[PDB]
Design a protein around this nucleic acid. Sequence first.
RNA 1: UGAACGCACAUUGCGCCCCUUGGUAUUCCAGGGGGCAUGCCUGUUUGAGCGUCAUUU
RNA 2: GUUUGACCUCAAAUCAGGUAGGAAAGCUCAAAUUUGAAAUCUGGUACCUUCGGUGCCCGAGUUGUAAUUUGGAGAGGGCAACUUUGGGUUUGUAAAGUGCCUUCGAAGAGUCGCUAAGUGGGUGGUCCAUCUAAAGCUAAUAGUCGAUCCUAAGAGAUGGGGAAGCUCCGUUUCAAAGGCCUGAUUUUAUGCAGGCC
Lengths: 53, 51, 32, 131, 68, 55, 199, 58, 62
Amino acid sequence: RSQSEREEEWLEKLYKKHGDDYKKMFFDKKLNIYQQSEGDLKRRLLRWKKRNG
Amino acid sequence: FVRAESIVAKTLATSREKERIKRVSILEDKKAKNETQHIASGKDFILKITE
Amino acid sequence: FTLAEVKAAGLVDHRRQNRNQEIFDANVQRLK
Amino acid sequence: GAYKYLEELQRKKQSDVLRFLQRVRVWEYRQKNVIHRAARPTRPDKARRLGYKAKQGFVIYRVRVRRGNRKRRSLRATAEERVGRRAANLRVLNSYWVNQDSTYKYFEVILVDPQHKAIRRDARYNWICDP
Amino acid sequence: SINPYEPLIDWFTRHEEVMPLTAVPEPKRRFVPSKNEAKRVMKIVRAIREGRIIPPKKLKEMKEKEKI
Amino acid sequence: FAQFGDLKEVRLARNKKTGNSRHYGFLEFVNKEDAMIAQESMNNYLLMGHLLQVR
Amino acid sequence: LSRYVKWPEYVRVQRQKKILSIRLKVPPTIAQFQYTLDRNTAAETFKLFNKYRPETAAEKKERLTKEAAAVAEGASPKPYAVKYGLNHVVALIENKKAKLVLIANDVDPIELVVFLPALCKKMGVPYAIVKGKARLGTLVNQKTSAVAALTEVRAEDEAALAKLVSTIDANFADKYDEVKKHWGGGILGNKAQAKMDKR
Amino acid sequence: ISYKKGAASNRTKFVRSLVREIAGLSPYERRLIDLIRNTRAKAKVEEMNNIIAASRRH
Amino acid sequence: APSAKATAAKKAVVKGTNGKKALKVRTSATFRLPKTLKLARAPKYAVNTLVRPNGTKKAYVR
RNA sequence: UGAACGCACAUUGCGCCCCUUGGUAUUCCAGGGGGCAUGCCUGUUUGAGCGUCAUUU
RNA sequence: GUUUGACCUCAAAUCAGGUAGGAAAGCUCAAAUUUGAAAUCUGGUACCUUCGGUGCCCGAGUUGUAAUUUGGAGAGGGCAACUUUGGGUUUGUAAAGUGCCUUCGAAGAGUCGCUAAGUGGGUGGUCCAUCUAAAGCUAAUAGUCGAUCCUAAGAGAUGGGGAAGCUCCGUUUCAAAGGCCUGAUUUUAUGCAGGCC
């Protein structure tokens, strides 16, 4: 089960702006358009990192 | 019958237009007497609009 | 098997209830 | 939702509002044919409870039947059978009670059109298309 | 001795409710952008990429080239 | 208000230092029963974002 | 002779119902729907409500296709519109979210809206009975709409909505709240008032 | 036990009482109210008494 | 006697100067079904003779 | 022919609409082909009703 | 504005497409807002890989068509460094499942019994026991003589009404029951106006 292109770009932006700070990615109004909990962000970002490196 | 809103709107718009005309007339009077010291602009501009 | 019997077995009739311990244990063992 | 209020209101059939409305509506009904078509349900909440959907292929007929067991058998059954005979291309889904007199009882019958594609192509209602 | 047209008495609606009827929590879809529209937009994107839907710019281009 | 009957006096409150409406005034009708009609039809008139108060 | 043939049955019944509407002594809950907003208040209400008209199907489709075409090559505020639909508006009223509710006065199954003024007054929601269900549908893009509502308004029109609510409170609520609860429809005809009121 | 005998919801009682206040009174209930002012039956008379008490002050 | 123009002004404020009605005096004695457009169908898919006793016909052609 | 479908029928009687062909043929006559039942449903188009409304920048 | 236009109800067409006559296993709706977006559907038309699909268009529909839910509850959120994936090639920050925490949590009326209730109600047991009605699905020789034409007593469709029905009554009846005529082409610019019986 692989991610989509737009999701990968969104996670790209999140990682490049905040890194591993999930609390700031949770409270960001420009990148977290659909307000998503820290757990979901961490899980999706971990999948993205595992696929890329 | 004449509704109140028509009268109020006429008064307000005519008051605005009258002030516009007074300002234009004072500016032209100042330019005519070559008293262009405390005026906004002394140049006769023309704007050409074309599609 | 009642819902309690199926749940106790690690994973069917919704009308039946459990009120006897021996029958419940026998059904749980039967499921296992 | 608004259907709870309608259901609770229709449970008081001798109150001023419903008594007045029924008095006017029964006179209005008696001027039309015995079996006529309703433009829309008179009690949409009851139609929804009985399985009516506001989509193409759902029909409502109003029918009045004489009361009494004398002649000089259920009344609802006769009403539904007459309505179904009138519209032989549809199946009688349900029916409910709208009004009554000292002479007639008035019912509204919900029918479904099996040949319409809106009923054929949805799995929730294409059971009635089977013969 | 009984008036059949007595005025209505508002014995229940005269007392305002201070707070809503139910305590249902607010869904999360009322605070974030639409999801149904997101899916519909992505469906239109997929149709555009397959050539089934001509984009509006290309359509505007085609109506300025024939009608002469 | 001359369309509701003949008027006798119409005065408006203004600022003394600069002529500017104080947003209220008084006016008198020749017919007393004309004032009642003029009051019943404009007592809650929503005009230009204002609720006229005629009494 | 038989001159009745100058009217078809449907016209005759249609006018008989009109006569029965004003001759019968209607109960207060159905009588209250004859008291509607006046010309100025109704004209000012539809100027605010016409600025929040929902997008039509074509406009919404065009707006979504522009976004799709932008995405296919390579952060928005919440929308604002008038709320409609009977169940939706009723759910909004009992949650105390509607700022103003317009109720049509000509719903054919009148029992669909009889509880609405009472629910609006009990729940502390401003309401107004507006003449014309086909006019409420114009600002909804439907043929008819039984109700309409305003839940959220743009910050430019927040003052206008408050002023409209105050105007309706002064013109509609405080004016009719004593006669609203009286039986209506006791209008006497000339041939009847001449023989009863005079005698 | 089942939900069908749980309790009465706040919205449910609200709707029932609002419909009671709006619909009016059936003729025999008007007769009962007139009689009172001057298991099914017990419940109906208690409802009429509650209506009277609520109409008086609250 | 609240003048005469005060009543008209109140009616114009409240009603709005759209009262009068236009109707025809000479109505028809009997109402008939009006004529409407009746479209045409446009489908979507498609010598002296005598009879003889033996059940046949005989014709004399001169 | 028959549930039997243009109308009738104890007659093997009487019509209407569209296209096309042939005889002196724009008018007349004939031949050939295709249509015209009722109840109901969804939709299209054309309507009726002082039934309800709105209608001064 | 004596104008113009929205709806509502009722009509018509040899209108487009249809339909009737006769002979061993469990589940699904309604009832609580998608409101940050009627997300739903018939039909016409053009193509295609045609028991269907896609694009476009006219409509139905907010007096409610989709997704979600049916006490066996269920729903909105949060946490697992939890688990899973369709169609003849898949992908959308899409659709689900399990465990725990937290906030909530509707229920079928001329119906039960003249006409109701919601810790209600139905049925049983010598206070207790058991179910959840008034909604639904589910396998095992003639132009010329007659007929043909016309109406007579009468019979009998339509409109309407009765009857469980095979059918009966009623013959112009509270039926929108159909023909004809006139016009410079119809005064905010080429969308029929008036009249007769």
